[PDB]
Amino acid sequence: AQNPNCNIMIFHPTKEEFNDFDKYIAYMESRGAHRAGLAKIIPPKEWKARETYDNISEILIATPLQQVASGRAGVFTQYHKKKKAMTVGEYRHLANSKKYQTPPHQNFEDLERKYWKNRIYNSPIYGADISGSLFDENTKQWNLGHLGTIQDLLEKECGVVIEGVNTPYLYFGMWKTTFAWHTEDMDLYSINYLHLGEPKTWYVVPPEHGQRLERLARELFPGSSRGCGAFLRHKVALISPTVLKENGIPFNRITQEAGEFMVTFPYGYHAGFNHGFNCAEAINFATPRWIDYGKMASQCSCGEARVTFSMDAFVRILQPERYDLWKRGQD
Ligand code: NI
Ligand SMILES: [Zn+2]
């Protein structure tokens, strides 16, 4: 029972330890990293996702989303308004303009205070959920497009490809661009690499305390709780760290810099924001340990959020001795 305080652990793999992705995930879990819900991984010195980040200005952001928030005192609901297509070059210019740029700050505590206090103002534009990857095909270690985990069973056994789940998503962010409180689809793991730019702050609740966050969310959004039994699947709730601390919700905060990986573990609730212009890439993955989490993931009741995929192939192939038991439990 390592990591008793559910601290966010930072890992420094050697070049050799960076070869087998699944093996390093298991090593991190042997150290209790998953208890925090998130871990940071610093890649070895000479490792690189790609040679250079030139020629990225021409990338198409077909549907940038304006993230409109409404609320106050650290509790907000966010909705996405569709905007017209832009290039990464135009987006970077907009992010670095006087209206959207990172406001002056003394330190993190000051920037964090400005983000939570002024959230309803100057609704940021997020170049989120773009199908694609910036990892060079030559990169053979921790290439998000080719992690080689058991999640490959979805496409291998069923021919099912879901954008962002088993294919990478690119995210071009700007100051105040936000990711609302959520666990991954099917309570999968996720991995995020910050290719370039300004930091990304993450808030994370330890998986053992996930229900405490759900209880607080039900009390903060009573209308949403009456309509859906898993409304955090909607991914629209913003809850500040001050509100978490006031309500005794255990959490940790860590900031991710460019060149660093962040891994989220099954049922690790997380939320955060981008400090300024940046580009991150993310994808889901799975291990044999996740199958029990996937089998029990609470799904959206109202239909606003999807039931991403069936657990059938995973149970039938990787837990065959428990397949009939799983089937009887599904009715
Ligand atoms: Ni996530
Ligand atoms: Zn719902």
Structure tokens given for 53: 């980040």
The residue type found at 331 is: D
Q: Would you say 118 is a known binding-site residue?
A: no
146 is in an annotated binding site: no
* Cα–Cα distance, 192 to 38 (Å, whole number): 11
**Residue 140 lies in domain:** 9-330
In a domain, 295, yes or no: yes
- What is the distance in A from the centroid of ligand 1 to the CA of 11? 20
Residues in CB range of 270: below 8 A, 6 or more apart:
37, 38, 179, 181, 182, 183, 202, 203, 204, 205, 264
Nearest CA to 268 among 144, 168, 169, 184?
184
As for how many domains the chain has, the answer is 1
- Residue 126, annotated ligand binder? yes
Separation of CA 270 and ligand 1 centre (Å): 6
Tell me whether residue 4 is in a domain. no
Closest ligand to C-alpha of residue 302 is 2
Backbone CA torsion sign across 195, 201, 206, 209: negative
C-alpha distance from residue 175 to each of 105, 115, 131 (Å) = 13, 9, 22
Nearest ligand atom owner, CA of 299: 2
Q: Known binder of ligand: residue 23?
A: no
Please give the resolution of this entry in Å, rounded to 1 decimal: 2.0
∠ CA 136-199-73, rounded to 5°: 140
User: Which candidate, 124, 121, 131, places its Cα nearest to that of 174?
Assistant: 124
Q: Would residue 252 count as lying in a domain?
A: yes
CATH number of the domain bearing residue 245: 2.60.120.650
User: How many Cα neighbours within 13 Å face the side chain of 147?
Assistant: 28
C-alpha dihedral (42, 48, 50, 56), degrees to nearest 10: 50
The reply to whether 302 sits in an annotated binding site is: yes
Residue 3 falls within a domain, yes or no? no
CA–CA gap between residue 280 and residue 194 (Å, rounded): 4
In Å, how far are 17, 76, 300 from 307, measured between CA atoms?
35, 25, 7
**DSSP class of residue 269?**
E
Ligand nearest to the CA of 304: 2
Measured from the alpha carbon of residue 234, the closest ligand is 2
Residues 6 or more apart whose Cβ sits within 8 Å of residue 89: 57, 58
Residue ranges of alpha helices (H) inside the chain are 21-30, 88-95, 108-117, 153-158, 210-220, 222-227, 241-246, 291-296, 312-318, 323-330
- Tell whether 2 is covered by a domain: no
Count CA atoms closer than 13 A to 79's CA, side-chain side: 4
- For 152, the 3-state DSSP assignment is helix
Q: How far away, in angstroms, is 59 Cα from ligand 1 center?
A: 23
Q: Radius of gyration of the chain from Cα atoms?
A: 19
- C-alpha 269 – ligand 1 centre gap (Å): 8
12 annotated as belonging to a binding site for a ligand: no
- Rounded to the nearest angstrom, the distance between the alpha carbon of 80 and the centre of ligand 2 is 17
Structure token digits, residue 10: 């930072």
- 80: which strand partners? 67
- Ligand whose nearest atom lies closest to the CA of 192: 1
| Residue 226 belongs to some domain of the structure | yes
32 burial via Cβ count (<10 Å: 0-12, 13-18, 19+): middle
Q: Answer yes or no: is 304 within a domain.
A: yes
